[PDB]
Design a protein around this motif. Structure first.
Motif, PDB file in Angstrom:
ATOM      1  N   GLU A 153       0.851  -1.175   0.000  1.00  0.00           N
ATOM      2  CA  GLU A 153       0.000   0.000   0.000  1.00  0.00           C
ATOM      3  C   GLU A 153       0.896   1.237   0.000  1.00  0.00           C
ATOM      4  O   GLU A 153       0.762   2.092  -0.864  1.00  0.00           O
ATOM      5  N   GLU A 175       1.136   4.082  -2.905  1.00  0.00           N
ATOM      6  CA  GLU A 175       1.002   5.508  -2.638  1.00  0.00           C
ATOM      7  C   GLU A 175       2.187   6.211  -3.267  1.00  0.00           C
ATOM      8  O   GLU A 175       2.057   7.293  -3.822  1.00  0.00           O
ATOM      9  N   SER A 195      -1.549  -1.092  11.659  1.00  0.00           N
ATOM     10  CA  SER A 195      -2.579  -0.495  10.844  1.00  0.00           C
ATOM     11  C   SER A 195      -3.329   0.579  11.630  1.00  0.00           C
ATOM     12  O   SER A 195      -3.752   1.583  11.064  1.00  0.00           O
ATOM     13  N   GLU A 250      -0.986   3.669  11.266  1.00  0.00           N
ATOM     14  CA  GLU A 250      -0.926   4.004   9.853  1.00  0.00           C
ATOM     15  C   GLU A 250      -2.186   4.779   9.510  1.00  0.00           C
ATOM     16  O   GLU A 250      -2.150   5.697   8.693  1.00  0.00           O
ATOM     17  N   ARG A 301      -1.780   8.513   7.245  1.00  0.00           N
ATOM     18  CA  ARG A 301      -2.532   9.000   6.106  1.00  0.00           C
ATOM     19  C   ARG A 301      -3.764   9.769   6.564  1.00  0.00           C
ATOM     20  O   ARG A 301      -4.880   9.462   6.145  1.00  0.00           O
ATOM     21  N   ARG A 331      -8.529   4.801   3.925  1.00  0.00           N
ATOM     22  CA  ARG A 331      -7.566   4.739   5.022  1.00  0.00           C
ATOM     23  C   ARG A 331      -8.005   4.972   6.477  1.00  0.00           C
ATOM     24  O   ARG A 331      -7.265   4.633   7.396  1.00  0.00           O
ATOM     25  N   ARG A 384      -9.051   2.885   8.554  1.00  0.00           N
ATOM     26  CA  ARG A 384      -9.428   1.466   8.516  1.00  0.00           C
ATOM     27  C   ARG A 384     -10.036   1.063   9.835  1.00  0.00           C
ATOM     28  O   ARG A 384     -10.867   0.153   9.886  1.00  0.00           O
TER      29      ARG A 384
END
Length: 579
Positions: free
Chosen positions: A29, A33, A87, A90, A94, A109, A111
């Motif tokens: 990912e 990006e 995650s 992360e 983003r 994003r 998530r």
């Protein structure tokens, strides 16, 4: 070692559960990006590469969650933790800075994977709280629930608390996930017009069983103090639930007492001989009533202390109610039934009950003595009308044999009096089937009646004595009688000590011949029995035949029987009115 080249390989590694490679899935990912923001890259290719990323990421998800549903899997749960945080942060990367996405990409994003976890913890907390385990469907539900939650949170503080890092708050997440489910199944029943029994079981549960038996009394105890969970039902709705439960139970004991009374009423009505412990027992009404009360009080103690106190102050009024409507039914019993074989026997049973009420209510309620006595009023009235009714027959047989002191112009007292002692002592028996406290309570009544009646005879101005010698003779007589009475009554259970100097001290006023002496025995006699008035003083001096204007003097004593310091005269001359 690695990494894993082809995305095929990687997918295959996730499919066999291995999550070392989870990091790479993010790398892709990130790389995408990158490759996007390099400009040079087809949109038709972007979409390909991104569909492949997010497909890999779906898989990764289902592996992590797959593990965390049942954290009894192994030790790559550290792995699943690590990733359910990579995650998680992360997500923060983003935000709006990694947040520009070249179109054709479709943002994905926030998530929120920790949130997914919460969703699973909660869904498992609801698979378990909802398993199928009767007092009620509801009470069985609450049972199975409380059990399961105590069990499971015990497991979490025991075993999952050291495995999970501090970020997740294993514990808060679990207890809260269960707790809120509980509270949901309760909020569900609150949306109903519920049975009385149901109101009690859920109110008990919310108020007592939940926060003590589950949240507090276990080993969980220590931990959830930090969590700080709330009520199950909400405050206002709980207080409402109280308010209606009270009215339920208060009504229960009202109706139940009412029925107890009705039933005993008919026991009397039906000429039931009462049963005898030592003196008779119809304590049926006594203990059965106080048992209704005690169990209601337990039921409302078994919620809050305050539910309890409320139901106490509330039960006082319905007790008052019962006692009142009891006096009335006993009185009606008196008035009508009388032929009945066990009329007197019944009477004595009921009289007996007052002991138990006095005794039990003094300990149970802890009220002021005027409040105590205010409640207890119509029990005196019942025992009054009781005593009056059993005695009435002997006080009559005694009515002529007292005239006979007047009739024989006091020719032979001791014989007349002996006739009376015979006629009273032939009544000692059945009054033994009466509680000891009331035994002596009745003996004072008889004692007092003998003395009153005697002084009523001496005050009937129907004997004047001409010369001292016969006044002394009369004195010797009175004293003889006073010793007979005092002796016999004391010896038969009276403790009416106050009465003792009634007769002897009058003998002395009769016998005494000099003025001053009579003034002094008058002073002293007003001291014992100060309800002694000029009326009686007169009717007594009437039997003196000498002294004509020393009357005026001896009376101007009594002229001020006015206390002002203390007024405690047990009625003696209050009850003897001669004019």
């Amino acid at each position: 070692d690695g990494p894993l080249p082809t995305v095929e390989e990687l997918k295959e590694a996730l499919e066999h559960g291995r999550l070392e490679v989870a990091w790479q899935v993010l790398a892709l990912e990130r790389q995408l990006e990158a490759a996007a923001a390099a400009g040079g890259m087809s949109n038709e290719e972007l979409v390909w590469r991104q569909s492949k990323v997010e497909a890999l990421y779906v898989l990764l998800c289902d592996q992590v969650l797959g593990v965390l549903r049942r954290p009894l899997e192994a030790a790559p749960e550290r792995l699943s933790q690590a990733l359910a945080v990579v995650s998680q942060e992360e997500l923060e990367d983003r935000r709006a800075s990694g947040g520009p996405l070249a179109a054709a990409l479709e943002a994905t994003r926030p998530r929120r994977w920790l949130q997914r976890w919460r969703g699973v913890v909660a869904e498992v907390a609801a698979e378990r709280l909802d398993a199928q385990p009767g007092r009620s469907e509801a009470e069985s539900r609450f049972l199975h629930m409380g059990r399961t939650m105590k069990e499971d949170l015990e497991v979490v503080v025991e075993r999952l608390k050291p495995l999970f890092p501090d970020e997740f708050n294993v514990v808060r997440t679990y207890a809260e996930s269960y707790h809120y489910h509980f509270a949901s199944h309760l909020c569900a029943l609150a949306q109903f017009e519920l049975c009385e029994r149901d109101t009690y079981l859920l109110l008990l549960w919310v108020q007592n069983l939940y926060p003590n038996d589950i949240l507090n009394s276990p080993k969980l105890a220590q931990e959830l103090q930090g969590v700080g969970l709330g009520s199950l039902l909400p405050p206002k709705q709980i207080r409402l639930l109280e308010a209606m439960f009270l009215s339920n139970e208060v009504t229960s004991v009202k109706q139940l007492m009412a029925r107890a009374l009705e039933l005993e009423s008919q026991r009397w009505t039906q000429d039931v001989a009462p049963q005898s412990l030592d003196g008779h027992c119809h304590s049926e009404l006594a203990i059965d009533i106080l048992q209704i009360i005690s169990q209601g009080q337990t039921k409302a103690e078994n919620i809050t202390s305050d539910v309890g106190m409320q139901i106490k102050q509330l039960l006082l009024v319905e007790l008052a109610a019962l006692l009142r409507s009891y006096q009335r039914a006993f009185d009606e019993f008196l008035e009508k039934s009388k032929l009945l074989r066990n009329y007197r026997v019944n009477i004595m049973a009921n009289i007996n009950n007052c002991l138990f009420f006095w005794t039990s209510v003094e300990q149970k309620w802890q009220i002021s003595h005027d409040s105590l006595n205010r409640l207890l009023e119509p029990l005196k009235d019942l025992k009054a009308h009781g005593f009056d009714t059993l005695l009435q027959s002997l006080f009559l047989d005694l009515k002529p044999l007292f005239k006979k002191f007047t009739q024989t112009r006091w020719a032979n007292p001791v014989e007349t009096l002996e006739e009376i002692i015979t006629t009273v002592s032939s009544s000692l028996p059945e009054f033994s089937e009466l509680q000891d406290c009331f035994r002596e309570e009745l003996m004072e009544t008889v004692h007092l009646h003998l003395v009153k009646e005697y002084i009523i005879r001496l005050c009937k101005r129907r004997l004047v004595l001409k010369t001292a010698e016969q006044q002394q003779q009369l004195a010797r007589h009175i004293l003889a009688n006073a010793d007979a009475i005092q002796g016999f009554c004391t010896e038969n259970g009276s403790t009416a000590t106050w009465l003792h100097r009634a007769l002897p001290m009058i003998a002395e006023i009769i016998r005494l011949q000099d003025s001053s002496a009579i003034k002094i025995e008058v002073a002293t006699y007003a001291t014992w029995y100060p309800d002694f008035s000029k009326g009686h003083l007169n009717a007594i001096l009437a039997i003196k035949g000498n002294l004509p204007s020393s009357e005026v003097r001896s009376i101007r004593n009594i002229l001020d029987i006015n206390t002002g310091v203390q007024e405690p005269p047990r009625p003696l001359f209050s009850l003897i009115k001669v004019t």
